[PDB]
Structure 1
Amino acid sequence: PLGSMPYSDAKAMLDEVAKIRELGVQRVTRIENLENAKKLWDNANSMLEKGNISGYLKAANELHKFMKEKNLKEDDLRPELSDKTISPKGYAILQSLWGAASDYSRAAATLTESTVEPGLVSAVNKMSAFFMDCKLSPNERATPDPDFKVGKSKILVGIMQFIKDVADPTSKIWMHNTKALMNHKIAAIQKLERSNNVNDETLESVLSSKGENLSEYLSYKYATKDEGREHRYTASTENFKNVKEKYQQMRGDALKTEILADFKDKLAEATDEQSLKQIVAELKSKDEYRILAKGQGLTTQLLGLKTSSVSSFEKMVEETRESIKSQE
């Protein structure tokens, strides 16, 4: 065999061989990982091709997350993609997204809050470009289809759609739960699409907003955080034993605002038909729900009229079903 090779030399040649083995296993997982990332990139190009904004968006994120987890740069994966191509139809979208993202980014920076929201819209724009730089060589320029053109509105919804699905259920913009607020702006934009009333002016307006008007952020005309309106049957906390802490020194009107708001939030965690059906069921079955459904004035109660709070809580559900039945 190696017969006669000294003890020392056996050790040395045993170490120098260790080195090559690492260099080998490396060259393998590198080839392994790149081949993998090459797939993730295609998934995203697929979505992008068949116009699914809210999807190419999520797909591109998968790629990015992997890439970043395996210390890989666009330059690493580009050589492997010399086989594929991005349709001029895809670059068309890609550019429209960059625009939308870029503007929504600038508008989101309001005097109220101008850190998280703008910061997130960028998070997206930045990592969208990532998917594109994994293909487009740094010296080349994008070749879009001047003919093709998507609706700024359809793209915006998509971005918000995405930000909502990836933000944390504790992620907050200004005083609101990001999830809730993104869901609120999606509905707001859609309403404009339905009334063919989408222009630079109405849009910059929704994008610029942080729902600083409870009155209109919850659709509960009497929303407030103080005294409010009178009664004869103010909404009190007791009488029920299943009302979590917070709702205590909460008196009537202001209390319905509070519950209403928390519902809006919990309700924004729905990802589908069944998911929502439950969150609503699980909500109706609470005791703070009955605090909403209980009147506050003789008239409204000696008739059993659907209160305003419930009136509103039913709308919030509707806009959510809608904000879901479009994701499809």
Structure 2
Amino acid sequence: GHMVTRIENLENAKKLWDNANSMLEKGNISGYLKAANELHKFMKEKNLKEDDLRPELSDKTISPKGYAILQSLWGAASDYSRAAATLTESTVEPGLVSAVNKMSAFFMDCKLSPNERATPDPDFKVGKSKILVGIMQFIKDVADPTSKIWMHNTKALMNHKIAAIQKLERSNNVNDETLESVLSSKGENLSEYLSYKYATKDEGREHRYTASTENFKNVKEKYQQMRGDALKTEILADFKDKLAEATDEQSLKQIVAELKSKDEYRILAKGQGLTTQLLGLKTSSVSSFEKMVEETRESIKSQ
């Protein structure tokens, strides 16, 4: 087991920084943040500081275009941080977005002394929505699997917001008001969040065959005392969370195959009324699950 020189670690930090700058230059926001994050992780592990790396970057430059993107990123992040501070919740999401700012600042501080001014190209424009999606993608990548914003898993909420912003992009309805609604949302409306009209934590609808965990040997213990629409709501929520761990197309297909093999999925797929079972259509909850797979696919088919 084994040692590395300071020279050698600085040379690798220089490469990590270059990779970040290169992503910055191409306008790949999530790629830049991720690359910044790797630089920080590597430097922390080798006990290297920004001022150790700075002299070594003397032959490298953040372009004017680069500083313009970083200024837009800074602005979008500050604004998002404020917008995410809400009556429902104001600690986690703002903390996460302001930390994205601190990560970018770290990339800048490797190159610039404490008071040096950024020199952004004033003509270079970058769409607010591409920035926000990038921020959200980075937060989704880096937040702990157990992180929660209000009552919802953080990775899942990010994918939800990224899909909402992408829908605004596709239908040409992106403006400050529609972005604000997304940035300030915590998924308070459960039925929209899960894409399931009958989402509830209460008794929901009357059913001749109210969904039940009895007759499913393998169902997790947490569901055993839930029934009906509420049972399905809880299964869908946990499925949404598991789907949010997907990182690429192969990963998503694998997770989907796992979830569809579970007794919880058969509960979703089992109709709760006799007329409905005789029709031979997908249940509403299975439909919701399929929409979540599509949402997750869109939040991940991008970079």
Query: Equivalents in 1 of 2:73, 2:301: separation in Å?
Result: 22
Distance 1:139 1:224, change over 3 A: closer
Please say which of residues 207-216 and 60-69 is displaced more in the overlay.
60-69
Please say which of residues 68-77 and 157-166 is displaced more in the overlay.
68-77
Q: CA RMSD in A?
A: 1.8
SS in 2 for 1:246: helix
Q: Tell me by how many angstroms 1:28 deviates.
A: 8.9
Provide the residue aligned with 1:61 in structure 2.
37
Please say which of residues 139-148 and 222-231 is displaced more in the overlay.
139-148
Q: Tell me by how many angstroms 1:232 deviates.
A: 1.1
Matched, 1:266 2:247: no
Structure 1 outlier segments of 4+, above 4 Å: none
**Identical amino acids, percent of aligned pairs:** 99
Q: Tell me by how many angstroms 1:139 deviates.
A: 4.2
Any idea what the Cα deviations from partners look like across 1:171-212, whole Å, max 9, x if unmatched? 111111111111111111111111111111111111111111
Any idea what the Cα deviations from partners look like across 1:145-168, whole Å, max 9, x if unmatched? 121111110011011101111111
Query: Equivalents in 1 of 2:70, 2:60: separation in Å?
Result: 16
Any idea what the Cα deviations from partners look like across 1:288-319, whole Å, max 9, x if unmatched? 11111111122211111211111111100111
Query: Equivalents in 1 of 2:7, 2:277: separation in Å?
Result: 72
Distance 1:27 1:221, change over 3 A: closer
Query: Equivalents in 2 of 1:175, 1:105: separation in Å?
Result: 19
Q: Tell me by how many angstroms 1:70 deviates.
A: 3.3
For the Cα contact (< 8 Å) 2:23–2:31, is it kept in 1?
yes
Provide the residue aligned with 1:228 in structure 2.
204
Q: Tell me by how many angstroms 1:72 deviates.
A: 3.1
Q: Tell me by how many angstroms 1:67 deviates.
A: 2.4
SS in 2 for 1:236: coil
Larger radius of gyration: 1
Q: Tell me by how many angstroms 1:27 deviates.
A: 14
Provide the residue aligned with 2:114 in structure 1.
138
Q: Tell me by how many angstroms 1:225 deviates.
A: 0.8
Query: Equivalents in 1 of 2:115, 2:77: separation in Å?
Result: 24
Distance 1:27 1:172, change over 3 A: closer
Query: Equivalents in 1 of 2:197, 2:3: separation in Å?
Result: 65
Counterparts in 2 of 1:36-115, with a 5 A limit?
36-115=12-91
Query: Equivalents in 1 of 2:247, 2:48: separation in Å?
Result: 32
Query: Equivalents in 2 of 1:34, 1:274: separation in Å?
Result: 35
Q: Tell me by how many angstroms 1:81 deviates.
A: 0.9
Any idea what the Cα deviations from partners look like across 1:16-71, whole Å, max 9, x if unmatched? xxxxxxxxxx9993333322211211111111111111111101111122223333
Aligned length: 302
SS in 1 for 2:192: helix
For the Cα contact (< 8 Å) 2:33–2:103, is it kept in 1?
no
Structure 1 stretches of 5 or more lacking a match? 1-25
The structure whose RCO (Cα within 8 Å, separation 6+) is larger is: 2
Query: Equivalents in 1 of 2:125, 2:112: separation in Å?
Result: 21
Provide the residue aligned with 2:293 in structure 1.
317
Q: Tell me by how many angstroms 1:135 deviates.
A: 1.3
Query: Equivalents in 2 of 1:219, 1:188: separation in Å?
Result: 12
Distance 1:301 1:144, change over 3 A: same
